[PDB]
Amino acid sequence: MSKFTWKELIQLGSPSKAYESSLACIAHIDMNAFFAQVEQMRCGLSKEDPVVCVQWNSIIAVSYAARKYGISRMDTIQEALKKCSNLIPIHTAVFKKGEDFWQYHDGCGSWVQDPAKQISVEDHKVSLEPYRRESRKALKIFKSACDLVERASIDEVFLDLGRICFNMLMFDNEYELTGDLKLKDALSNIREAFIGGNYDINSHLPLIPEKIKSLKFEGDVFNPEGRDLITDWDDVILALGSQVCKGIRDSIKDILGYTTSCGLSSTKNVCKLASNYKKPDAQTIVKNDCLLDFLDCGKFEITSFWTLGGVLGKELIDVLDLPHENSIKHIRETWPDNAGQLKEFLDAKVKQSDYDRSTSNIDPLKTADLAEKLFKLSRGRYGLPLSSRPVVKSMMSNKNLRGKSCNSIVDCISWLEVFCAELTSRIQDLEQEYNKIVIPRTVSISLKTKSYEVYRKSGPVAYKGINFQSHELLKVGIKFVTDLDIKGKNKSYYPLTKLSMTITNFDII
DNA sequence: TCTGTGCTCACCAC
DNA sequence: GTGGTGAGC
Ligand SMILES: Nc1ncnc2c1ncn2[C@H]1C[C@H](O)[C@@H](COP(=O)(O)OP(=O)(O)OP(=O)(O)O)O1
Ligand SMILES: [Ca+2]
Ligand SMILES: [Ca+2]
Ligand SMILES: [Ca+2]
Ligand SMILES: [Ca+2]
To answer: Where do the UmuC domain residues begin and end?
Structure first.
C-alpha cells in the first residue's frame, strides 16, 4: 500500500484545495537577471554577452555572463568596468522632463566619455515600463499553460501544476517513459482503479508500479543522501510536474528569449528557496523525502523564509533563543511532537518582561497560527494557497529633485507631463492585468520645498467622457501645482526638492 | 553567482 | 491624514 489516499490525489484536480494536499506540485519560476535579459534581448545580444542594466551610476541587474567577472549590484558602473572592459552597460529607458514618452538613449550613460552622450539625472526619470511589458508577456504564456498562476512579483510566478499532473497521470496516452513503454501501460493499475470508482476516498492508494520507477525527473533533483528517486505517488506527481514545467520554461525561452530558475516542491515556500538554489537556467526539484536534507543543507535559516526575513524573524531569533546557524533544524528539534508545544512556549516567553508589546510584531491572541506556521515551515510542509494580488489602492509617480531644475510653475508642469504619461501607461498595464476598465477618480499632487516642507493638494479628476484620458489627469495636476505655487509665495518654495502625482480611488468598472 | 541623492507601495503611531 | 518606515523591486 501507498502512504497517500485517493482523496489527497483527487484533490489535485481542484484549484481551491490542490495546495493542501501533501501531493501538491507547485513551481516557482524566476527570471534570471531580469532587466539585464530584457535589455540583452532588445539589443540583439547573446546570453553569454556580459551585459549590465544601469540606472545613473548604479547597476540594477547583472547578467550571469557579467558575473563571471565578479561584477555585482554593489559595484558602480566604473568599478564594474575595471573588472571587465568589454562590459556592455545599458541604461534603462528614461523620460525627459517636459515630454510624455520615455525612450532609450543607447550608447549614452555616465560611463561614456563623450559629454554629448549622457543621461542627466537632473532632467530624466527612469521608466521601468519595458520590464513591465516583458513581464506581462511572460504572464500570458504562463496563464495559457497553467490554470492557476500567481504573479508573485514582476519576474516571478507560482504555478499550481495539480490539474496538469493529475490529468497527465490519469489520462495521458501520448507520453513515453522509454522506448516501447508508455504511461497508460505503466500506470494501468491506478488508471483502471480510478475510472473503476470502486475505491473508498479515505482508502490509501495502491503501491506505485515498478514500471513507474523508470520515470524521469527533469532538472536537478536535490538528494545529497542518494534517496531512491520514485518511491511513492508524490514522487510520481513531482516528476510529471518537472517535465510539464520544463516545457513551460522552454516556452518562455523560445517565445521571449528569457532563461529562468525554477523550484519544484509540494509547497510554495520551499519552491521559492529551490528556484533560487541554482542560477541561471536550472530547475531544482525537492521531493518530500529530501525536504529535511534541503532545509538543513546549510544555506538556509529561519530568516530565509518569506515573511521571516524581516524584523519579525529577528524577534523570533531573540524570542526562541535561536542559534545563529542551523536554526531550521533547531526549531524542528526543539518541538518535534506538535505545533502545540511551540505555541505554549511562545505564550510562556511572552509574559516575562523580555519585551514590550510596543515594538513587537508577534500577536498573542493568534499565537497558535505562528506555532503551526513555524512547525510546518521547519519540515517544509507549510502550504499556502496561490492568491491573486490585492487590488491597487494607489499609484504614485515621483521625482526626487536635485539642483535648480524645478524653479518655476512651468518646470513643475514639465515634470507633471512625465508623471502623467507614466501613470497613464501603468493604468493600461492594469487594464490588461484585470481585463477590466480602471479609472482613478482622485489625484494628489505633492511637493517638498527648498527647505523640505510638504505641500499637497488632493482632489477629484473630471472626465468629459466615460473613458479615462491622460490630458484630463494632467489638467487637474496643473491646476493643483498652480494653486500650491500661489500658496507658497513669500515662503520657502523654489527650487523644489520633490514633486509627485499620486492617483487613488480606482473604479474597477 | 548587503549598497547608495535608486524606485515604488502599504501600513499604522503620532 | 500621513511621514516615517518596512519591505520588496
Ligand atoms: N536593489 C535593487 N535596485 C534596483 N532594482 C532592483 C533591485 N533588486 C531587483 N531589482 C530589479 C532589477 C532586477 O532585474 C529585477 C528582479 O530582481 P531579482 O529577481 O531579485 O534579481 P535578478 O532577476 O536581477 O537576479 P536573479 O537572477 O538573481 O533573480 O528587479
Ligand atoms: Ca529574478
Ligand atoms: Ca525576483
Ligand atoms: Ca515518501
Ligand atoms: Ca533571548
So the answer is: 26-309
How long is the CA A75 to C1' B3 vector, in angstroms? 8
CA of A13, C1' of B8: distance in angstroms: 37
Biggest CA–CA distance in chain A, Å, is 88
Verify if strand B has an atom below 7 Å from the CB of A357.
no
C6 closest protein residue (CA to C1'): A310
**Strand B contacted by A59 CB (< 7 A):** yes
A34 ligand 1 Cβ < 6 A: yes
In this structure, the answer to whether residues A420 and A438 fall within a common structural domain is yes
The last residue of one of the domains, among A128, A162, A193, is A128
Could you tell me if A274 and A28 are in contact, meaning their C-beta atoms sit under 8 angstroms apart? yes
CB A427 within 8 A of CB A485: no
Nearest to A193 by CA among A11, A5, A25, A16: A5
Residue A324 within a domain: yes
Reduced to 3 states (helix: H, G, I; strand: E, B; else coil), residue A256 is helix
Q: CATH code at A101?
A: 3.40.1170.60
Total count of domains within chain A:
4
> Is A99 domain-assigned?
yes
Q: Do the domain assignments include residue A123?
A: yes
How far lies A227's CA from each of A221, A273, A491, in Å? 10, 20, 74
Resolution (A): 2.5
Domain holding A247, by residue range, is 1-31+129-299
Q: For residues A148 and A12, state if they share a domain.
A: yes
- Together in a domain, A225 and A327: no
Which bases of strand C sit closer than 7 A to a protein CB?
2-3, 6-9
Q: Is the CB of A35 under 6 A from ligand 1?
A: yes
Binding-site residue positions of A for Mg(2+): 30, 155
Name the closest-CA residue to atom 3, ligand 1.
A60
- Phi–psi pair at A203, nearest 5 degrees: -70, 140
Residue A290 lies in a domain: yes
Q: Grid coordinates in use for A489?
A: 509665495
Residue A153, CB, less than 7 Å from strand C? yes
Asked if the Cβ of residue A311 lies within 7 A of any atom of strand C, the reply is yes
Nearest CA-CA partner of A399 in A447, A333, A471, A343: A447
Whether A402 and A502 share a structural domain = yes
Backbone angles phi, psi at A199, to 5 degrees: -85, 150
Q: Are residues A144 and A253 in the same domain?
A: yes
C-alpha cell at A18: 490542490
Any atom of ligand 1 within 6 Å of the Cβ of A67: no
